[PDB]
Amino acid sequence: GMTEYKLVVVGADGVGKSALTIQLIQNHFVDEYDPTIEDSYRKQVVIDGETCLLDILDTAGQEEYSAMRDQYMRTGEGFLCVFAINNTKSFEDIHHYREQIKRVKDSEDVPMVLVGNKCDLPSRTVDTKQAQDLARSYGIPFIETSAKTRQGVDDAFYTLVREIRKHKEK
Ligand SMILES: Cc1cc(N)nc(-c2c(Cl)cc3c(N4C[C@H]5CC[C@@H](C4)N5)nc(OC[C@@]45CCCN4C[C@H](F)C5)nc3c2F)c1C(F)(F)F
Numbered sequence: 001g002m003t004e005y006k007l008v009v010v011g012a013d014g015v016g017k018s019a020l021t022i023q024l025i026q027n028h029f030v031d032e033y034d035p036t037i038e039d040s041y042r043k044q045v046v047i048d049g050e051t052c053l054l055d056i057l058d059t060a061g062q063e064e065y066s067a068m069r070d071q072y073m074r075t076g077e078g079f080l081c082v083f084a085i086n087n088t089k090s091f092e093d094i095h096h097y098r099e100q101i102k103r104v105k106d107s108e109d110v111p112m113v114l115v116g117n118k119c120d121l122p123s124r125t126v127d128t129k130q131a132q133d134l135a136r137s138y139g140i141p142f143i144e145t146s147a148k149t150r151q152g153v154d155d156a157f158y159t160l161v162r163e164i165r166k167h168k169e170k
Pocket residue numbers: 010011012013059060061062063064065066069070073074093096097098100101104
């Protein structure tokens with residue numbers, strides 16, 4: 001049997017949620033993906049010898065807090081909170097995503113990774129120390145990624161799976 005891990009990718013428009021997801025699954029950079037499409041993708045992987053199935057929701061669309069939308073998000077076991085290292089506003093929004101996840105999950109201990117995407121670009125408007133400090137304040141890992149080159153992408157998703165696997169053992 002293989003365990004299935006339900007992962008949700010969140011963050012502002014344009015941070016690279018779709019490119020990160022498509023890069024992880026299909027091993028290629030999709031540069032101008034329709035910003036309005038939300039979809040889910042699966043991939044069979046081996047993490048620390050465990051053959052398992054990832055089910056990843058790439059979020060998009062309207063911000064809305066209906067009971068049905070909350071319940072759908074509540075089925076997520078782990079969350080990647082993504083910002084772009086060249087977009088200060090996307091980094092300022094991270095606290096909001098963390099707050100909504102903690103509310104629907106009814107806990108401060110939710111498997112989560114802070115992802116600083118577009119690390120292939122030299123314009124670091126978001127300070128590295130500030131992002132590391134934010135991740136430290138939540139007790140979660142901070143991983144820099146590039147959906148373009150795949151740098152850090154497997155590490156971000158596999159770290160999240162390791163956090164879920166550990167959370168289920170509590
Ligand atoms: C657990 C949970 C429950 C639940 N019901 N919904 C969510 C959720 C989702 Cl699914 C999408 C959001 C979203 N959109 C999806 C994509 C990205 C931007 C746009 C709209 N298209 N935007 C915002 O906030 C946007 C900002 C800017 C304007 C005012 N808001 C408040 C802050 F300033 C940030 N939050 C979002 C959000 F919270 C979540 C969670 F957290 F998991 F994502």
